[PDB]
Amino acid sequence: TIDEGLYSRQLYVLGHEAMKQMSQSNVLIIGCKGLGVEIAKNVCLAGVKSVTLYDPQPTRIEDLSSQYFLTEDDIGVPRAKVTVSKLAELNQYVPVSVVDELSTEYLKNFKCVVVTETSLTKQLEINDFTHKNHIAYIAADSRGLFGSIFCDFGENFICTDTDGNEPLTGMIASITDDGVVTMLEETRHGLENGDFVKFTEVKGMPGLNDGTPRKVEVKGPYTFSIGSVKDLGSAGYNGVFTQVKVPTKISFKSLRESLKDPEYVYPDFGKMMRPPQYHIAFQALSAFADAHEGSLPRPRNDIDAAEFFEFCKKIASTLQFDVELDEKLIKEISYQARGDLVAMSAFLGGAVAQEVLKATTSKFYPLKQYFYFDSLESLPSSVTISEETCKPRGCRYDGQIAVFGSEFQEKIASLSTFLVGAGAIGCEMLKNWAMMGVATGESGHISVTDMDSIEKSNLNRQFLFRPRDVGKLKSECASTAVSIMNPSLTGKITSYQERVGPESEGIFGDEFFEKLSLVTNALDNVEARMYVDRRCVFFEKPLLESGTLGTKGNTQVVVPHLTESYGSSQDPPEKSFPICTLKNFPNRIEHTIAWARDLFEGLFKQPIDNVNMYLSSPNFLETSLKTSSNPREVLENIRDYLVTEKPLSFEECIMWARLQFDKFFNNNIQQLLFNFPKDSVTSTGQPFWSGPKRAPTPLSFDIHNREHFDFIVAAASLYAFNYGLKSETDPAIYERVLAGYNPPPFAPKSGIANKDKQELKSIADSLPPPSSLVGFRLTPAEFEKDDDSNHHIDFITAASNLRAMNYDITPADRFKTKFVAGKIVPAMCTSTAVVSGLVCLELVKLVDGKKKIEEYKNGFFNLAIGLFTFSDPIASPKMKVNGKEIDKIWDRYNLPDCTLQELIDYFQKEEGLEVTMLSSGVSLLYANFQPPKKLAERLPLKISELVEQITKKKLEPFRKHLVLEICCDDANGEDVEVPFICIKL
């Protein structure tokens, strides 16, 4: 009963069973500050059964530093009572409640218990109960730029999936008598030692087809070992192996037991001596709060730091921790005890929400057990951070002023950022900017652009949008929502509806891009990322890239003249199957899905486009007869869709669908088996239909069968949609119409001048003239995966499964068909929160203008295994030009709009280089090998005039520069790379 219209992207990460088990779990959340509200939001968007909140503390002003469901009108009201109403709107399937008082036995009502903003004594009291009653217990804490997570799921936690990866499967070439299983040519199984596999469709060793998992002993990248198969047989030929995943038993320890001997998780390997320090420091914080009526150390206060360090010494002595305490780091923890940052809150909230989902669904490998994190590299160094600057000012930014100071707050308030995209990461980034106070000053401004509209499936991870906002523009809704969150951003946010690309340079030009301070990408495709990266490189602006894929995520920072750009890195490209594999010899469901998509496009889209273009373009036939690859195909499509096979009623559509069934699933297979019989052999004597080639078999139309009827219904409905007829769904009419069908005879044909032009002319003159058909247009079918009533995925699924039945491939359901055909990217709210937190932690480094490259950190993480890693950015490569140091990426030549000859002379005389190629955009302006007449005609023209002449397009009035790529040779003839040229028009 999962609402797949809303959880579409999340089901591809978790699954149906995981979400079914998740929708029966109760979560209690103690503490409703920024971290607690982030956890509650992520849990509500995830889809647990219910959420209960407990926070009777009255609201204060500083709480607004990271609580985005609190307004200044709520001062003096308990935080839970004012957060429940706003949390109840995120998801309609997840009720949210509030408890005035919490008793121990009450905890038995819940499946998971999350604890924040609670003293250590109360945490021990809660955990002593939630441990022996088998209740998952997560405790999270956030102090300044430091964070801690602790997980305790019981002594007998069962983890079904330990990495989140799909089970490994592959094809076998041969299995020897000693269990040595070999993969096909250039195919790597990818198995690791200790895995279990099950074999199917094995020839010569039927015993391995029983299904019993067997051990794996990897022997190489292509072969492995399974043990002894002597009894079953001597040798096995071909077959498919599939990995088997076995549940694991994980044993946790209680908080009281794990205080003395903790088990750490290291988010970074460059600093592995710190977690032992943080373990003492946080306990000392709890003791200090207990000894001062719950008052944490004052910001940048030396007396409190000294007392806190004395508490740390006492704790380290009591626990017999044989670790020397780092005074500077501990005192730093003391200074930022009252800090409350939205970036740290978002990061830890995403992590803790993922831990909650692990506890409820018994999936993925959890943290075990202590996770201590810090981003101390973000602390500003170009401003004064002392007791005087960090004291609270009685404003909503107190939690951030207590870490960064008032001067850095004024630096933040004057930012002029540019956010590209308004998806999930865009919404999180806008929330973080609103909470941090970005662009709330006189000179601040925010610009957000996105050309898409809100859909139902987007509401599962984009929390700024509501079901009443479905169908509206993302940028406007996001700007309005974040102006609601922070009233000071009224009039400081501008929302566009423009796609960032070559066509939008009239809006995002020099004037727009020269006032910015940084650019943040929230895109989902590589082309736009590359374009924005090139624009930032040209204008020399800092860039923040961030990406997610299911539970994986990464963040990268590009700094002018310091690090390399985004395009300097290469990612694994997409895999496209060979045309010969798709056309005739498929062996996986992906091949059949691709074939079905091509069939859909070629049946309902291309012929309609040709018909429409014929009835509109007056001279279309002449152009097609000498331009299109197959003019005969175009003419046949036009004839068939205009006169020959034009339906007058839906019954004719049904008959057409039956005919297409015969055409594509019964006759082409007969032709293929006539060309290559099942008993044919290759040139080397081996049987043809062996290995990656599976012998097909024609399908006979059986109306009672489900797949045949589904294909008929989908095809007839789509044809009627093309011709604008009235579709129906009652099986009675289909069974009545298809009963009286006589299949036309078909026999495969063995084969055995300028008359073809005569036949083409005869076909052409048979077509109706455009004048006789005025206003008659056929509606094409534009692929749309997200609508379930257009019969698109239904048709693709039916065709794919029928072709699988042809080749005895295992058919897939509509869920997997929609995942594969639609190129859906799995997405989660927790990953979005984590990447937004990391990006906003890098943003404060960018604001402070840090110069050293070791102070920035590109981040990568995988939440399925609890892996976090941070690495320094790659420095921009240097080069030697004319005995001078030149940055490859961030250097350019500035020249006037001089003639081509003057440009060549300047390069010859100044740089001592001989120009051999000069191009602009995609055009070759000048080449050393061109005939002399062309050069003599082109040399004395200005660069702008030359570009206008060659590109056959006048320069737009808003064009103010030209980017030229130049390749030149040295005096000796050796090639030398040089930066691009920036001609100033």
Partner: protein
């Protein structure tokens, strides 16, 4: 991108391909028209075949789109000009030059691969009735590939 394309173009200019001639269309660096001469020891002897090469924006990180323009009677080449070359679909790596692609296509024309065909009828004719395949190939290369 542009620099690599121009380097390949200059290399073709510096060293003649003899059996091929590739160059940009008009003044566009991302659209080339190449010419291939039929091998002497093949039915396509004395023929000129025109190929259209479309360089993707992500070149050389994505394969160029090479499509025949002249009609050819070959088991691995269909009626739309698509070529069954492994180095152009998923084996592509940013280390292959256009001269290598043209040499591979010439070798493909030298001897087809009927065990993994793209046009099953032509492959069947080639495997069973060789003389008819030769006659059809000569007829096609005389009707389309000449003049």
């Amino acid at each position: 991108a542009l620099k690599r394309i121009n380097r390949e173009l200059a290399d073709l200019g510096k060293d003649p391909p003899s059996s091929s001639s590739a160059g940009p269309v008009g003044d566009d660096l991302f659209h080339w028209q190449a010419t291939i001469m039929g091998p002497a020891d093949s039915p396509y002897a004395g023929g000129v075949f025109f190929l259209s090469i479309h360089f993707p924006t992500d070149y050389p990180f994505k394969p160029p789109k090479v499509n025949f323009t002249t009609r050819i009677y070959h088991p691995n080449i269909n009626s739309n000009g698509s070529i069954c070359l492994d180095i152009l679909r998923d084996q592509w790596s940013p280390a292959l030059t256009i001269s290598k692609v043209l040499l591979s296509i010439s070798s493909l024309l030298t001897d087809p691969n009927p065990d993994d065909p793209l046009v099953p009828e032509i492959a069947h004719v080639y495997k069973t009735d060789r003389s008819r395949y030769e006659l059809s190939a000569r007829e096609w290369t005389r009707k389309y590939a000449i003049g």
